[model samples]
Target: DIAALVVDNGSGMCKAGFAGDDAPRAVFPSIVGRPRKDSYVGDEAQSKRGILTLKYPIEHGIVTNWDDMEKIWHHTFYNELRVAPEEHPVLLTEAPLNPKANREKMTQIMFETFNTPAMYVAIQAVLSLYASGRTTGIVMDSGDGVTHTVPIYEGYALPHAILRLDLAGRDLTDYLMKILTERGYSFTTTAEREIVRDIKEKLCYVALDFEQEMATAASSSSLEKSYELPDGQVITIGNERFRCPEALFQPSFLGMESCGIHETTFNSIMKCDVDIRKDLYANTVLSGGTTMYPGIADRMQKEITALAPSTMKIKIIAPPERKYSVWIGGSILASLSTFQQMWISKQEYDESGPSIVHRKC
Candidate 1:
């Protein structure tokens, strides 16, 4: 039997996993590269791929151009999977509230180019909830570009339960840079972003009382070792290695007039019925690259417990590979006989076209 595949074409990362496996087979930057010149080679060519002239696509969740996106998607799905059009059924995931034009375009490409036997498209949060093994829970997916919540019911989503916060890893990175600069540290490079992220993950915590943490950070006379850069400059940091991560709890620090994650999650839950609201908190699942950060589980629980009623309890589950939770669940579902029927097949696409795409029930 041809194996099934789960594809998550997310803004932060593109992931592909075997249908029954509990992990993704591969994931790469949701990036597209164009050759700068005929003689360009490897990293040199890659660096020039999206030079000053050419554009880097994926403005938000939607693909800006069909041609550019097709190239990127084709290279990833075909080359990475090592499978042709007829090899196996593919289960693809797209962002929630995915643009209609982009959605239609993606469907057209998969059907026209590869003649893929079957395809299923859904949101990443939907799949993440499935992997989380919760009938009802909130999914705050903090990925490369945005953070949003999708409340799952059994195996499907409660459409009205969706809540999106315009913040994401990109904003957090920028926030970190601003904080670092204010403290006399200036860094430029992808490496610097990673290091800052490392610092955030290791030391950040959600202080319910933001003022307390800020006061503690300011008063502590802790010292940190300095590292010398390649340009012969050495800079020293402090023991306050985790201040930026706390910004998730206090968006006010980032100059955003929005409440933090705790508020956002609570607001979404209250939108549901009172009884289910409490139940939802019990099965809350964390599935995203950011959620994998150290101290996230404890921090989430602490904040959530304080916000809810005294008798109410909060629970947080972090799967081993929290990032791939959705991909794994969707892929495994594809292998099931019942689930296989949910996909739009090559025959269906050929006959009914986009109209039939909505029949994914």
Candidate 2:
């Protein structure tokens, strides 16, 4: 069988490859660089980071620029995956609460622009559940732009019960920047933001006991970590390490009115049927870039259990490498013989146009 192409259209980066592969063959920022003379997309655009003006095709996990998105898809299909679009079926993951028009637009692009043989659009939260080998769970996905809490029951998402927050990876980066600025460190370019992001990934971690850890950090030197900036200035990060990620548990630190991830997780599950609530808690799954932080699963498990019934068994399924879990799930689904019947064929799109996507996918 010809392998299907799986694309996880993320706000921060795009992960694409042939289905059934262990992982994505190509991963690049979802940004387009417009230089003085010409424009660049994917790796080329990312390479021009410091010199060229960068614009994101996706904003808050939604595609905002169709032209840039088209360029990104083209680059992923041709430059990265090294495949002719017409030969392969395509499977794409859509963010929760994605607009109907966006789905139609995606279908149009696949059928008309690329002439893909068949395509499937899968909801990101549902795919995350699949990644953990579960059909029912409360999925908390904290990616670059937004964090979403979705309750899935038997491979279907409870749309009305979905909860989301803006406090995610990008928010942590912003919090880190503020902390650095307060300590007399400043950044001028987007490239510098990358440096901060690296620090967050390497040094920042969730604190099991926020207040206790804060006190320990204040009284000891071991809690501090030294990060060398791009310009060779070694800055010491102390309480800010845990404090930055603390915003996930306490959004008030970032001046946001929304509840934190833990609260959102509980609230989402609570919205579901009581009989399924325990099952959801027992199968709670965490996926995305933000969940990569050390101690997050432990911290979340602790907090969530404290808020739930004493008899309820709580299990947080956090894969060690979960950043691409949604893509991995899509790959698995697209590779299945049973999944063949689900793909919207070119003939179907031609007969019904974009509206067919609303029903078919």
Candidate 3:
């Protein structure tokens, strides 16, 4: 079979599967767990829980540990997908502003280590645009590691105009930790951290009107919610429900000096040309796991529209599941018959070496 493989190697998770699939078949953390000198990868590693020393191969969406990364790729192909890497073409998504050396190393892995027949690496931001079925738009990705607002025009990202912020899902988790800590509750184990994340996902939401909600939540009895933790402890969550995700809209509340998601989206569009700005506004695509918050899309629309020009009709197109949008785009791209011509073959790599990816891909 000439079927291609699609992989979105993200900081938070590695999404991998064959081309033409609607979603990734194997989704796991980008961490390798080692306990007592024995290393584990993928679900096996993550399932070890608090007993393992987790080593993240990718940090901030950039590969940091090649050894662990190699282990991850091996597990994803052989153990998870049950496929021989040598037989099929592989298409991978790369982080924006990735170094040339990193790309060459990735190329080496596909052609040398895994011995894949062909490969193609694409930008995560551009793939996000492709996921929305648009060649031009502004993609605001509030992911696990970092948040980025990238303006894509004609299937290309405007490098100079990209907006990046340190606030993301990890930050929210940390904030939740802080909030819980202040309440005399602490989490020390990996499972507890996972529980905390669950609380954030299940209990947290963006407040449409932060101050007003705070006021109402303080005076009314309807705001408090009790959640049962893994330990069976029922803890009451009050204003914390909205306060946790409030940082995304008001970064200064978390001591950050950059613009929030709304302003960043507007500012990124402003950096682009005037003629396409309207189109960009109309096609604003929201992708990433952090964008999964309950009221985020509606909140973003309301805030973005307030800042946008009155002449422009703002429309934020958030995928049904924004977390998998990039991976979905890779699946769509790899399934295309025309995309076959874009792959860098093993023969071309043998002749031109690793640098062939930079030119051919």
Candidate 4:
């Protein structure tokens, strides 16, 4: 069988690869760079990046800049995945509450521009659940832009109950930069941001007890980590390691008014029907880049259990593949032979127009 292509179109990162693969072939930023006059995909490893007029294609889970987005997809198909677009059906993930305007706009482009044999679109919450082999649960998906706590019943999402917190991975990175700069640091360039980002990715982790950890951090040198810069500059990071990631559990750490991730998720579960509340709590799944922080699952379950019914058996599933759940789910969905009938073709799309997508998926 010719492997299909599954692309997790994210606001901060774009993952692309053939279906049935364990992981994506390419993982790049959602930004496009124009360094020498032509558009190129933004790469973190590309040293000496002088900002290069950065352009982000997606913002807050919506494709705001279609042209830059096309550049990203085109680059993924040709350069990253090394495949011809026409030979494969493309599987894409969309936001749960994606607007019809953009949905139609997204629909027209795939069938009209990319000229793929077939294409499929599904909401991230549903696919994230499907990735964990479940049809009903609550999902806390925190990537770069926003953290969404989505309640899913069977395979459908409950938009009214969905909770969103503005603090996410991007904000945490900003906090890391802000904290370091306040204590003497400079991250004014693109490469510098990557340096800071890499620091957070490697050293930052969630604390089991914020207050207790802070007390211990003062007396112990183990909490201190030394990160050497490219030009032989070493910066020592202490306390900030867990403090930055703690922002997810306590938004006030970042001076945000919104509630924490656990509260946000608990509130989402409470908004749903009384009967499913138990199941939702027991099956809370984590998917996205920010949720990859160590001890998040355990801390989430600990926090959520405190807020739920006393006898509730709370469970939080943080699989190793959490960050790529949506794409992997798409891979599983597209790999089934029965899935062929679910794919929309140019013929069907041409007949009913882009509006046909409202019913197909």
Compare the candidates by lDDT and give the number of the best one: 2
Model 1 Cα lDDT, one tens digit per residue, 282-315: 8778877766666667777888888888898788
Enumerate residue pairs that collide in model 4: none
| TM-score for each of the candidates | 0.86, 0.95, 0.94, 0.94
lDDT of prediction 4: 0.86
Model 2 steric clash pairs: none
Which structure is stronger by lDDT: 1 or 2?
2
Instruction: Enumerate clash totals for all models, in the order shown.
Output: 2, 0, 0, 0
Q: Candidate 3: misplaced stretches above 4 Å? A: 35-38, 47-52
User: lDDT at 286 for candidate 1?
Assistant: 80
Q: Write the per-residue lDDT of candidate 3 for residues 318-343, one digit (tens) a residue.
A: 88967899999999999999987988
Candidate 4 worst ten-residue window by lDDT: 42-51
Per-residue error for 251 in candidate 4, Å, reads 1.2
- Over 84-103, each residue of candidate 2 has an lDDT whose tens digit, in order, gives 99999999989898889999
Could you tell me which 10 consecutive residues in candidate 2 have the lowest summed lDDT?
A: 34-43
Q: Using alpha carbons, what is the TM-score of model 1? A: 0.86
lDDT of each: 0.69, 0.89, 0.87, 0.86
TM-score of 4: 0.94
